[PDB]
Design a protein. Structure first.
Length: 223
DNA sequence: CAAGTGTGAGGAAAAGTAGTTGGGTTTTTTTTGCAGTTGAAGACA
C-alpha cells in the first residue's frame, strides 16, 4: 500500500520470503548482540523484509516474460507517485524528512509543494507549541517577549484534504489503465524511489541498505 | 570470497566560568553697629 499497491506483490515477496527468507519462516527479532562493537550482521528482520521487497519488485519486474506488467505501466506508477498530499501520512514523512539528514528530502524542503508548505505551518502552530512553557528576569525579559508576540499576534491575524485510503484509492485508479533498454531504465528509475521511501523512514546507509541488499543477493543463489 | 577479536575517538550540553567593561556608591582620612581697649608714632622737659 505504501505505493505501487500491486496486490500481487504482497505474496510475490511473501513467497520469496517463503523461499530463502529464513527457510520460509517469519523473521524473528535478532539476538542480544552482547558484544559492544555492534557488528552489521544485518539480522534485523525488517531490514531484510524491505530488501526482499525491493528485490522482488526488481526480479519479478525484470522477468515478467509473459509481459503482465506493461512497458508504459511501470513509469505510470512512477508519475502518479512522485509526491502528493497525504491524509496525514505524507505530511508526516515530510516532517521526518525535515531532520535534514543526507539531503534526500532536503530539497523537498526547498520544493515543498505549496500547501504541503501550508499544512506544515499548521502542524508547527499546533505541535511546536509543545515547544517551551527566560526565568526570573524581573518579569522583564518575559513581558517584553509577551508584547512581541502581542505584536505579530497573528495565528489568523473537501474538511478539505483527504485521508490515507482515499489517496491510496485514487492513485490505484490513476493507474486505472492496466488492461528493451528503456524499461530497464524505468525499472531502475522506480527502484531508486522506493529505496528513497523505505530508506527514509529508516537508518538508511546509502549502502548498508544495499550492503543489506548485497547480503541476501548472495544468500539467494544457493539453489 | 568471506567472517570474526581487539580497540580511540567524536560528539553533546547546562551550567559554570572567562574576558572586557562599567557602574557604583563605598568608603574616608561681599561691614552691616557697637564701645572699649592695646600698641603704636609722635612729641615733650
Amino acid at each position: 500500500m505504501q505505493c505501487a499497491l500491486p496486490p500481487e506483490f504482497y505474496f510475490y515477496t511473501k513467497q520469496v520470503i517463503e523461499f530463502e527468507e529464513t527457510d520460509i519462516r517469519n523473521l524473528t527479532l535478532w539476538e542480544r548482540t552482547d558484544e559492544r562493537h555492534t557488528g552489521r550482521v544485518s539480522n534485523h528482520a525488517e531490514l531484510r523484509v524491505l530488501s526482499y521487497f525491493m528485490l522482488t519488485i526488481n526480479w519479478m519486474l525484470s522477468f515478467d516474460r509473459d509481459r503482465q506488467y506493461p512497458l508504459k505501466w511501470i513509469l505510470s506508477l512512477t508519475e502518479s507517485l512522485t509526491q502528493r498530499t497525504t491524509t496525514s501520512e505524507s505530511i508526516g514523512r515530510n516532517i521526518v524528512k525535515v531532520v535534514y539528514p543526507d539531503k534526500p528530502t532536503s530539497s523537498d524542503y526547498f520544493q515543498w509543494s505549496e500547501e504541503e508548505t501550508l499544512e506544515f505551518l499548521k502542524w508547527m502552530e499546533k505541535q511546536f507549541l509543545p515547544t517551551q512553557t527566560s526565568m526570573e528576569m524581573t518579569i522583564d525579559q518575559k513581558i517584553a517577549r509577551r508584547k512581541l508576540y502581542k505584536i505579530f499576534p497573528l495565528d489568523r491575524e473537501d474538511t478539505h484534504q483527504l485521508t490515507f485510503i482515499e489517496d491510496l484509492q485514487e492513485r490505484y485508479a490513476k493507474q486505472t489503465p492496466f488492461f528493451p533498454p528503456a524499461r530497464k531504465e524505468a525499472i531502475g528509475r522506480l527502484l531508486t524511489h522506493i529505496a528513497s521511501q523505505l530508506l527514509v523512514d529508516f537508518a538508511i546507509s546509502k549502502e548498508q541498505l544495499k550492503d543489506c541488499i548485497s547480503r541476501i543477493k548472495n544468500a539467494c543463489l544457493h539453489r
